[PDB]
């Protein structure tokens, strides 16, 4: 919380200003320090608002002379951490390491400061409130700051590299969480040494993620390249061609429930889809999509198209009988009604329709059985909210299967009004065939564009279009509230006025004009203003805004598709049986390389 941290910092500065020892440590006033340390009544264990000692104040402002004088007067201040909530466990060693004062780190380790001291405070935890997540240990702080000398000095004094914070992250995870991504590779190389023998790269955090999986999730492409440099083998370099043998143990993740590629495509980070364009991963998912993914996706698309054709044919031949009542109202045009269940299935065509409806119900049950456990598997927000995983289509097909089952219930219980679920089910089921458009390059990015336009410019257009219809519907209704509805029936009731002016916004119906009668002049004025500001201005400004936001998000539209084709492969590999999806790569047991599976990439390095 921002105001709490502002109060904490203000109170900390007030205690510093209201304590002569803390002010002398801050301003490096050595004379006042000698006077205060000469007096025995002055407490060496004075604590500030955050529980900081005077040594913490000396290390905070890089006053080496003040810190050495305080440690000469009281060495045990090196062993005293802070004890208040935003800075629980922070010692002077943490602040000395953060400020990169190597002589101060030497002086603190000389006095016996704890090299395993853990700063379990709210300011040192990973949070959107905190601006840096450098860990909880001085070794993690020195690794994330970027000082190799302090790292070597802490390791020589007994710092444990295999130390986990409150999130379970080791020093490698917090190194991969840094946004620098350049010196962190050098610090990763430094900390891979002294880990001589489970290695530190195989230690998962509390989310179960290895540093390889964490680099895949967080979208650290440079750290991913640095990690594969250690997981490759150059076979030959004859001429301009070289053949490298990447290891797919930590990429393919055979047997693991949450594989590497599944964590990559389901990650919320925008850089996380830039891991799919790297040298082993792109070749692996490209081999999987061409060899196995695309034919299986095409036959599933054909099966879903045939299923929707059967559902549509069952909707066309829906059992309707003549009405058993007279049409007294002259504005009532209903001549047919739904049959009861006893009379619905009598003829042979009704038996064929019964077979098709059983096929439809079985398909809806299959759709629900495929869709429901994945919501609990990957979370409700990530399943329905990510474009790469097919977010809106899962909501659409769950609504479609629910409406089909509701129509089955209404058919069995003889409820009237099956058109209301059936039209919704037809519209949602046929618009859910746009999922399979992600399997084709001609149709994938256009479908992603349609998704971006619907949740983007269409909603912000509709919010103002609603206030224009609500104005002009009321105006058009009250101008025609004193006129005969038979001559101009476009605005005769307020719902009809709303629908008529909504159609007049999009110019899908003609302007109401009866030239044999005398319309009000207020209709002419209001409709001229409506034609100016809605038809001419906003309906063309929507085209202009779509054209402006098409080229801005065009590059983002192609990348999101290339990822959508890595999530279709990573699902089909998960959901389809194993005999249809053979293990990808080259088996090392055939060639004596071991029990590992490799991928061979031959590239022209010139």
Ligand X SMILES: CCCCCCCC/C=C\CCCCCCCC(=O)O[C@@H](COC(=O)CCCCCCCCCCCCCCC)COP(=O)([O-])OCC[N+](C)(C)C
Ligand Y SMILES: CC(C)[C@@H](C)/C=C/[C@@H](C)[C@H]1CC[C@H]2C3=CC=C4C[C@@H](O)CC[C@]4(C)[C@H]3CC[C@]12C
- In angstroms, rounded to a whole number, what is the distance separating the alpha carbons of residues 157 and 110? 10
142: left (phi over 0), alpha (psi -120 to 50) or beta: alpha
* Least Cβ distance, residue 167 to ligand X (angstroms): 43
- Tell me which residue of 9, 11, 75, 18 sits closest to 44, measured CA to CA: 75
Residue closer to ligand X, measured from CB, 86 or 445: 445
Residue listed under structure tokens 């080259």: 586
Q: Which is nearer to a copy of itself, 335 or 412 (CB)?
A: 335
Report the partner that residue 507 touches, choosing among ligand X, ligand Y, a copy of itself, none (CB closer than 5 to 8 A by kind): a copy of itself
Q: Which does 589 bind (CB under 5 to 8 A by kind): ligand X, a copy of itself, ligand Y, none?
A: none
* List of residues contacting ligand Y (CB under 6 A): 392, 396, 424, 427-428, 431, 434, 447, 450-451, 454, 462, 465-466, 469, 495-496, 498-499, 502, 521, 524-526, 528-529, 532-533
Least distance in angstroms from the C-beta of 393 to ligand Y: 6
| Binding site partner of 392, from a copy of itself, ligand X, ligand Y, none, Cβ cut-off 5-8 A by kind | ligand Y
CB of 435 to a copy of itself, least distance (A): 10
Provide the 8-state DSSP code for 245.
Answer: E
Pair 423, 407: CB distance under 8 Å: no
What, of ligand Y, a copy of itself, ligand X, none, does residue 228 touch, CB below 5 to 8 Å by kind? none
Name 245's bridge partners.
Answer: 600
**Residue 363: alpha-carbon gap to chain centroid:** 30
CA distance 95 to 138: 9
Distance CA 536, CA 453 (A): 21
- 207 vs 312 by CB, closer to ligand X: 312
Please tell me whether 510 is known to bind a ligand. Answer: yes
| Nearest-angstrom CA–CA distance, 281 and 227 | 13
Q: What are 304's two structure tokens?
A: 């879903």
Nearer to ligand Y, 110 or 454 (CB): 454
**Cβ atoms of 148 and 187 closer than 8 Å:** yes
Q: Which is nearer to ligand X, 495 or 594 (CB)?
A: 495
User: Smallest distance, Å, CB 307 to ligand Y?
Assistant: 17
Q: Which is nearer to ligand X, 208 or 495 (CB)?
A: 495
Strand locations in 148-285, DSSP E? 234-236, 241-247
Site of interaction with ligand X (CB under 6 A): 305, 309, 312-313, 316-317, 433, 463, 466-467, 469-470, 493-495, 498
CB of 213 to a copy of itself, least distance (A): 26
Cα 59 from Cα 140, distance rounded (Å): 18
Residue closest to ligand Y (Cβ):
451
Please say which residue, 216 or 445, places its beta carbon nearer to a copy of itself: 445
For residue 463, the minimal CB distance to ligand Y (Å) is 7
Q: Which does 82 bind (CB under 5 to 8 A by kind): a copy of itself, ligand X, ligand Y, none?
A: none
Distances (CA, A) of 559 to 272, 445, 567: 11, 9, 13
Count CA atoms within 13 Å of residue 474 on its CB side.
5
CB of 112 to a copy of itself, least distance (A): 23
Query: What 3-state DSSP class applies to 130?
Result: coil
Of 121 and 439, nearer to ligand Y (C-beta) is 439
CB atoms within 10 A of CB 286: 16
Which H or E run contains 403? helix 391-412
Residue 590 contact among a copy of itself, ligand Y, ligand X, none, beta carbon within 5 to 8 Å by kind:
a copy of itself
Tell me which of ligand X, a copy of itself, ligand Y, none is bound by residue 600, counting a contact when its beta carbon lies within the kind-specific cut-off of 5 to 8 angstroms. a copy of itself
Q: Return binding residues.
A: 510
Q: Return binding residues for Ca(2+).
A: 510
């Amino acid at each position: 919380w921002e105001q709490y941290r502002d109060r904490v910092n203000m109170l900390q500065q007030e205690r510093i200003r209201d304590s002569p020892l803390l002010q002398a440590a801050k301003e490096n006033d050595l004379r006042l320090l000698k006077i205060l340390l000469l007096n025995q009544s002055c407490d060496f264990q004075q604590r500030g608002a955050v529980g900081e000692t005077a040594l913490h104040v000396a290390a905070l402002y890089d006053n080496l002379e003040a810190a050495t004088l305080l440690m000469e007067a009281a060495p045990e201040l090196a062993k005293e951490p802070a004890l208040c909530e935003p800075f629980v466990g922070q010692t002077a060693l943490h602040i000395a390491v953060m400020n990169q004062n190597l002589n101060l780190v030497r002086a603190l380790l000389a006095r016996g400061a704890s090299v395993s001291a853990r700063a379990t405070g709210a300011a040192f935890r990973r949070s959107p409130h905190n601006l840096i997540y450098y860990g909880e240990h001085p070794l993690s702080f020195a690794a994330c700051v970027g000082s190799e000398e302090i790292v070597r000095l802490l390791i020589e004094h007994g710092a444990d590299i295999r130390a986990q914070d409150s999130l379970g992250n080791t020093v490698l995870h917090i190194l991969i969480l840094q946004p620098n991504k350049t010196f962190a590779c050098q610090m990763y190389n430094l900390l891979l040494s002294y880990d001589e023998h489970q290695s530190l790269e195989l230690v998962p955090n509390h989310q179960g993620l290895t540093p390889f999986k964490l680099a895949g999730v967080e979208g650290n492409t440079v750290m991913f390249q640095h990690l594969m440099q250690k997981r490759k083998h150059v076979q030959w370099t004859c001429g301009p061609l070289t053949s490298t043998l990447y290891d797919l143990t930590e990429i393919d993740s055979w047997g693991e429930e949450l594989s590497f590629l599944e964590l990559v495509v389901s990650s919320k980070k925008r850089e996380a889809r830039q891991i799919l364009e790297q040298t082993p991963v792109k070749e692996l998912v490209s081999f999987k999509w061409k060899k196995y993914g695309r034919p299986y996706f095409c036959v599933l698309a054909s099966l879903y198209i045939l299923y929707m054709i059967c559902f549509t044919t069952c909707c066309i031949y829906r059992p309707l009988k003549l009405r058993d009542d007279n049409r007294t109202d002259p504005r009532d045009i209903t001549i047919l009604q739904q049959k009861l269940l006893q009379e619905a299935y009598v003829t042979h065509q009704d038996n064929i329709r019964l077979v098709g409806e059983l096929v439809t119900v079985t398909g809806a049950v299959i759709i629900l059985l495929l869709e429901i456990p994945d919501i609990f598997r990957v979370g409700a927000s990530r399943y329905f909210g990510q474009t790469i995983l097919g977010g809106p289509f899962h909501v659409i097909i769950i609504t479609y299967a629910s409406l089909v089952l509701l129509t089955m219930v209404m058919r069995l219980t003889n409820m009237n009004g099956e058109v209301v679920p059936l039209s919704f089910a037809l519209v949602l089921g046929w618009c859910s065939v746009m999922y399979f458009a992600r399997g084709f390059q001609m149709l994938g990015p256009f479908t992603i564009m349609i998704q971006k336009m619907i949740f983007g410019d269409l909603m912000r257009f509709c919010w103002l279009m609603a206030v224009v219809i609500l104005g002009f519907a009321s105006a058009f209704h009250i101008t025609f509230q004193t006129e005969d509805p038979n001559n101009l029936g476009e605005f005769s009731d307020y719902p009809t006025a709303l629908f008529s002016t909504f159609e007049l916004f999009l110019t899908i119906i003609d302007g109401p004009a009866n030239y044999s009668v005398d319309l009000p002049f207020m209709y002419c004025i209001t409709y001229a203003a409506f034609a100016i500001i809605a038809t001419l201005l906003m309906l063309n400004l929507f085209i202009a805004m779509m054209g402006d936001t098409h080229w801005r998000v065009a590059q983002e539209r192609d990348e999101l598709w290339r990822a959508q084709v890595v999530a279709t492969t990573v699902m089909l590999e998960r959901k389809m049986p194993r005999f249809l999806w053979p293990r990808s790569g080259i088996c090392g047991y055939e060639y004596g390389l071991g029990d590992r599976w490799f991928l061979r990439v031959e590239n022209h390095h010139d």
